[PDB]
Symmetry: D2
Subunit: 234 residues, 4 copies
């Protein structure tokens, strides 16, 4: 019945789409932020990809490595790993029912499944652990087991950190929520089914080339979060 | 000593960078064009990737398939394949010394290696070969076996189908060549070493975000060649 | 009900399991045999994977390359083919044969992989590998070359074997029992002229 | 010169090949054994690949999944670890141990893969798989559990075996000869408690 938003700080918000977008539960689990880096320059994507931004040539080129691909592996040594943990949430209210991971489950006793994937790669230089650098990305995947809702459409502005509800009868604003950190994901949970909300939407010969070029720029976001440059794309 | 340009018609030009960019050899081998398609809509990239352009949402999303990945494989059947043939050219003059492929070499008797890769996938619907659709991409890779030249820099304009030489002493135009078809690749062959020429170049806080966003749009080209929409990227 | 048999020379024979073993049809498609080679002896497979042998060492060990992953870059050429030959179930009669260039007007899907090293300056071949296997959707003794009331013999060694029935398609072939199963689970024969592995 | 031996319980012993076989050091790193499991019997490997067995069928056949490719999506959890434990060559003495969270202040690189199925509603584990192998850069009888003048016995079964010498690191272990090599080229033992495959 509600809306789930995954921000870059690694947190999960949940809004009741009627009337207010009034927050119904926040879930902060310490897990870090959704993207990290120590150390032209390399820009991590939310997926796990890295991109090389040459500042001298004004170019962005794909490095042929991933955080995972680096783990497959001169002078340095690669460490790190990929993890999958699932949080059994009680939608709604709250809450954590369990935290399931590789070494064990952590249960509380008393319908929303929330999986965090985390990929870390740390480059260390022998004969020591002085860490020459690292990259670490993460994201949430969501499942419920018991478009947009009728009367109201839900959109998401990446560059504005805003979720918004518009009436299909007027297009006008019904409610709005501003977040204090960049948005990485957004799901609309409705009548049992989980529905992913796109971050990239605009709606109301050599013509269609511009239309398709207009489309290709519309489908990439480059943001900054607490000093970390990252890259969202489709 | 010269410059090699691979166009979308599947041809290979070669220019003497001094003084003129005067063409020295054209190589037309029937092999088709560098990208083809029969049949929202799907846009092939030069690599082999496909992209889905939703015209209603003004969005470009990655399909999780490649021309090769489709071959790995309901109602339809996939056929096609990937081929690697090498043309032993005589740089310079001309020419073909041999054409080496899977089933055999085709020799002439009397220093430039030119490999064409070709990826085709055809979707056919049983019980017949009426071909529900197809995609076919190709590209050239170049090797010589016996930046830019001194005094002169070589650049390439994708959207203008132009190769250009500029003096390092003034930045001014030394010579220029206009092609009649979109450019897919460009190599600068100099003193034994083969040097790939980038298709994307411009040269002369929240600041660097725009600088890096300016960079990320600079590194993608969406063109059209004889009706076929394609996509160049880094 | 029909019995389709993929031989290791590239041709496809069909038998009637109606207490005959008689051949109703047999198809040769000029793509070559399922295994080819050239001039530390190494052995390929149906896949095609690659394996390295020496008679002094006790072992057979994987080479970190495949025919395919060699195409992804001495000069290497070749490629991969996916061709489906449409048959009418009984007595063959190819209806459509669609390859990469286009379709010519029970379907046998023929995969072929080929890599050859050639002299950069000359073009002269240094060595090669060609691997293929059949797939076609609508008890055999691999020791010798027979399918078994009734039996049937080849020329050439067997590669794959399916049994059609009613429309459905069926292919067929303490820790001691476990290890014993692993033993008789890989096959290494000869063709011609060359060692080949049939995996599992 | 040193002899480093990776046992199948996760610990690493070193022997002096100076006509002793004596243990100079031995390292246990709490990451678990190299193979774990849970409750059509299937068998994993060091990689870790997965294989399916039934005592009625003559065979051992690949399942189209790995511990890793199951992580890439009953509910599945777990992950993959890459940890390198820096040792001083003789007598161990771990200098640095860098995992994904950070480095704590001859290097053993420990890979671990883990997948477990859990009940969606409950969280209760349904089954799991854990696979690990050691790698560390700066004649053994796998039949029994010994390395051979002098010999040495384990508890537990052997997984990998290297021989250090002068600085360099060396690990060691008609068509009849070919097929014979393929035979004694895979190992299927028991631990504990579970069948495991050591590939090649
Ligand atoms: W480095
Ligand atoms: W379709
Ligand atoms: W060689
Ligand atoms: W099950």
């Amino acid at each position: 019945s509600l809306v789930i938003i995954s921000t870059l700080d690694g947190r999960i918000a949940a809004l009741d789409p009627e009337n207010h977008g009034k927050k119904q539960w926040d879930l902060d689990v310490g897990s870090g932020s959704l993207v990290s880096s120590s150390l032209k320059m390399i820009i991590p994507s939310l997926d796990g990809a890295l991109f090389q931004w040459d500042r001298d040539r004004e170019s962005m080129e794909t490095v042929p490595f991933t955080v995972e691909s680096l783990l497959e592996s001169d002078d340095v040594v690669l460490v790190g790993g990929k993890s999958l943990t699932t949080y059994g949430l009680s939608a709604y209210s709250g809450k954590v029912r369990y935290i399931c991971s590789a070494l064990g489950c952590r249960q509380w006793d008393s319908i929303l499944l929330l999986q965090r994937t985390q990929k870390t790669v740390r480059a260390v230089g022998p004969r020591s652990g002085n860490e020459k650098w690292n990259f670490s990305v993460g994201h949430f995947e969501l499942r419920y087991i018991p478009a947009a809702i009728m009367d109201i459409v839900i959109k998401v502005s990446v560059a504005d950190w805003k979720v918004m509800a518009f009436s299909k009868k007027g297009g006008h604003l019904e409610w709005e929520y501003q977040f204090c950190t960049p948005i990485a994901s957004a799901w609309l949970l409705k009548d049992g089914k989980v529905i992913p909300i796109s971050l990239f939407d605009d709606t109301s010969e050599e013509d269609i080339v511009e239309a398709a070029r207009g489309a290709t720029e519309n489908s990439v976001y480059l943001g900054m979060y607490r000093g970390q440059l990252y890259l969202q794309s489709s």
